[PDB]
Design a protein around this ligand. Structure first.
Ligand SMILES: [Ca+2]
Ligand SMILES: [Ca+2]
Ligand SMILES: [Ca+2]
Ligand SMILES: [Ca+2]
Ligand SMILES: [Ca+2]
Ligand SMILES: [Cl-]
Lengths: 5, 357, 356
């Protein structure tokens, strides 16, 4: 899972 | 302190205020009004019930749930006569009689006083839309406390709610027809839950007052006050894909059911699914550590370049469930950039989900 | 193994039958059988195959297979085939691949002989179980209490449940002569027997062996081990010639007890009854000295008496009864109370007295 910010 | 009120005029106020002295409700008869207050120190809810029958002034504090249970437990149309006697609150209706313990009204905590800086009125239905559009995207118990809450932002003549957990975001904007200042506050999730619950669905307007460390909402005979949250809320504008060369459109329920089935054979912990977009086609795939596989192929409207992109399917499902609409628009960039998801027929809300590698 | 079956013909069978996390699936002689088991009990469901099919057997994860089928659209043709160590599920443009375990490893309950048999309507069995189910013990060390007595006598079937504190009994005639016989069905078995019944027009066939029970309804077959123990005698718990009969509207009595319950002891739930000519007074108090009092009109003409009991037990009975009028058969302050539907003696409930 990548971070939105 | 004495009052007599019909059951149905007490139930709704009681429910609103009920959701050691913190386990009690402060009751106050004053100026021909009964006022019921509950608090957890961070937030406070007040209900005002006009007293049309004979009554005597005074104040006490009674166990919240027990008093609510007694009144609700009484028959439809019951008249509930109440009086303080010694250390007890007597509650009588027909041949049902109850004696409850009390704590001194003197001991009931009051929130600090504050000054209103921003104010506006809006339909109840507008606040319902704003919260329901975004609520589910709030973090649950993130160590970044500001994410366990909802941004309420005013800009121009719009009130805007934003919620994110750092992996996905919801944002909703609604016109309210008033010249508003540019301003932002974070309402803790418990306040958001309560504010949502006070909306009865009637045509009574809501009145919002915002201070520097507080927010207050007035609707009908109810007054809800909550403290705000500290810290720097992220800016949803940063998060929206700066430019989308890839536009997808499909039925919301079809997409939902396809994703829901594929979810079945996704990793239990990580929930990953793969999306393959091509000329008018979406393929969804999933597999788990047991090498079991799901595949869904759907007719969609899609004209851009072919791409493959991964997601936590529960993030997608939350979005589609929150879109109560015919058609869903999806806007993409590349396999490692966030996706924007909307109702095809309405730009009022936008949903952003960061992918999985 | 191959079959293609309409979604809605798989759902009820799957619901009922849900390696012990796998379902066994067999295609034989035009029928798909599905079996689920926990080693104590078993459910087998049959479905007729109108579409082209091939014989064979395998096992597949229960919840996943169930979820997929339920997940698929209303009226979906679900095609299934074995392919290596995998089972393929196809419908429309959806495709799934589930892991399998061999059918030959799927555990059978031991063989047994039927010793007593009878047929009765579903609704009767459902009435018997429902009226009594709630009074079964949950995981008491007295293991025989964690289930339900099924007793045959003359022409009736009777269920008894008790947790060592309160008792429920229900008797129903079934129009067949029966030996005198009693068995204990494990509580999970009772619950599972209960939900196998839609109350529809298919008769239920019961078969009881020395250590096993089996219920046959339409396309479904349930089998359970019995509890190898000695149940308490319900005859010994019932109040002898209770000569004081109060009658009241079931709902009014329930609502009065429910409000009074609020100010009763949270742990022991004691409430007091004062009974006098056509009147009942209910009182409750807790350790915080909070007090509740309820007075209501009733039908009563016996000697004035007081009695206390556990209000949670009485509320349970009154909720189970769901009728117009209740009869409370009373003796004195030191004796149990029998509660019944004022219009039916077929179900009875015993609550002990409390000195409060
Ligand atoms: Ca006072
Ligand atoms: Ca917007
Ligand atoms: Ca995957
Ligand atoms: Ca259909
Ligand atoms: Ca009293
Ligand atoms: Cl007993």
């Amino acid at each position: 899972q990548l971070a939105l910010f | 302190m004495k009052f007599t009120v019909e059951r149905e005029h007490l139930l709704k106020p009681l429910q609103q205020v009920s959701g050691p002295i913190l386990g009690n409700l402060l009751l106050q008869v004053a100026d021909g009004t009964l006022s019921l207050t509950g608090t957890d120190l961070e937030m406070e809810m007040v209900a005002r019930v006009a007293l049309v029958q004979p009554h005597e002034p005074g104040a006490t504090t009674v166990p919240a749930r027990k008093f609510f249970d007694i009144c609700r437990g009484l028959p439809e149309g019951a008249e509930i006569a109440v009086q303080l006697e010694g250390e007890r609150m007597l509650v009588r209706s027909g041949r049902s009689r109850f004696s409850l313990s009390t704590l001194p009204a003197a001991d009931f905590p009051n929130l600090d006083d504050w000054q209103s800086e921003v104010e506006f009125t809006l339909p109840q239905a507008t606040m319902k839309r704003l919260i329901e559009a975004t609520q589910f995207s709030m973090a649950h118990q993130d160590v970044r406390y500001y994410l366990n809450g909802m941004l309420f932002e005013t800009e121009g003549e719009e009130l805007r709610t934003v919620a994110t957990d750092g992996h996905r975001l919801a944002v909703c904007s609604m016109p309210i027809g008033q010249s508003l200042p540019s301003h932002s506050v974070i309402v803790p999730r418990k306040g958001v839950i309560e504010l949502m619950r006070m909306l009865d669905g009637g045509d009574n307007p809501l009145r919002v007052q915002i201070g520097s460390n507080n927010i207050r909402a007035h609707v009908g005979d109810f007054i809800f006050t909550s403290k705000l949250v500290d810290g720097r809320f992220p800016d949803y504008r940063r998060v929206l894909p700066k430019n989308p060369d890839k536009h997808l459109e499909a039925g919301c329920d079809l997409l939902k059911q396809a994703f829901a089935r594929a979810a079945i054979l996704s990793n239990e912990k990580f929930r990953g699914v793969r999306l393959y977009v091509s000329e008018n086609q979406l393929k969804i795939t999933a597999n788990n550590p047991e090498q079991e596989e799901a595949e869904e192929i759907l007719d969609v409207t899609y004209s851009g370049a072919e791409m493959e992109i991964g997601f936590n399917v529960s993030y997608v499902l939350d979005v589609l469930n929150a879109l109560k609409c015919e058609n869903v628009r999806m806007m993409l960039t590349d396999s490692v950039s966030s996706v924007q998801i909307e109702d095809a027929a309405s730009q009022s809300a936008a949903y952003v989900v960061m992918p999985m590698r």
